[PDB]
Amino acid sequence: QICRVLAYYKPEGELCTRNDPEGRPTVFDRLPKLRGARWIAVGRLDVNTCGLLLFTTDGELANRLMHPSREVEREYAVRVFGQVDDAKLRDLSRGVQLEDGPAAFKTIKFSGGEGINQWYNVTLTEGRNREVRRLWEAVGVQVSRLIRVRYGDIPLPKGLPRGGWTELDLAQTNYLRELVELPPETS
Ligand SMILES: [Cl-]
Ligand SMILES: [Pt+2]
Ligand SMILES: [Pt+2]
């Protein structure tokens, strides 16, 4: 029946599978147990990737959101080990060649500076598995922590803590259905 959407702040170490016969933590463990409907993940995140992951009860909405007809930026807050040479930044912004062909960061802004380890905020328009890690890897830099903070026009909710979820209201939901050319819900 009604289209519900959740915004979840995935912690590192959680699986994206619906269940694990070992009892290992999954992104579905703390979601609200519904009935007569089923949460569906809008895409997936690597086990070691934190941040925004949408869920929705509506299969069509999930389809159109991870398969957009328009190129969508994904923004990540990245913590990297040690200080990064400026030329390495030039490479990442000009492009490198990895296992699945060339790739590049559409944007690289240096964020905070925690001791010797550095923070960068980067964006990309593709979404090949572990692309962000492999990008930094191809330039000789290991990734410490990786948070997804924005998918297109959708950022992590401000209050929302690590491992928590927030339900979108009808207006926010309809905003999503509009960005994807779906008719608006009325209740
Ligand atoms: Cl973290
Ligand atoms: Pt997917
Ligand atoms: Pt994290």
Residue numbers in the entry: 65 to 251
Give excerpts from the publication.
Isomerization of uridine to its C-glycoside isomer, pseudouridine (Ψ), is the most prevalent RNA modification. Here we address the question of how two homologous E. coli Ψ synthases, RluB and RluF, selectively modify adjacent bases on a stem-loop of E. coli 23S rRNA. RluB is specific for U2605 whereas RluF is selective for U2604, but also modifies U2605 to a small extent. RluB (1–251) is comprised of an N-terminal S4 domain (residues 1–60) connected by a flexible linker to a catalytic domain (residues 66–251).
The crystal structure of apo-RluB (1–251) was therefore solved to a resolution of 2.5 Å with one RluB molecule per asymmetric unit. The S4 domain (residues 1–60) is not visible in the structure of apo-RluB indicating that this domain is either disordered or flexible in the absence of RNA; flexibility between the S4 domain and the catalytic core has also been reported for the Ψ synthases RsuA and RluD. Apo-RluB is similar to apo-RluF with an rmsd of 1.9 Å (over 164 Cα) with a highly conserved core that encompasses the central beta sheet and helices α1–α3 (rmsd of 1.1 Å over 126 residues). Differences are localized to insertions of 1–4 residues in non-conserved loops on the periphery of the proteins, however there are two significant differences between the structures relevant to the different substrate specificities of RluF and RluB. First, the residues that form two C-terminal turns of helix α2 in RluF form a loop in RluB. Second, in RluB, helix α4 is followed by a hairpin turn that changes the direction of the peptide chain and allows it to pack against α4 instead of impinging on the bulge-binding site. In the apo-RluB structure residues 131–138 form a loop, whereas in the apo-RluF structure these residues are a two-turn extension of a helix (α2 in RluF) that directly overlaps the bulge-binding site. There are three major conformational changes to RluB that occur upon RNA binding. Superposition of the apo-RluB and the RNA-bound RluB structures results in a large rmsd of 2.1 Å (over 185 Cαs), however individually the subdomains align closely. Finally, residues 132–134 in the loop between α1 and β4 refold into a 310 helix and bind to the RNA near the bulge.
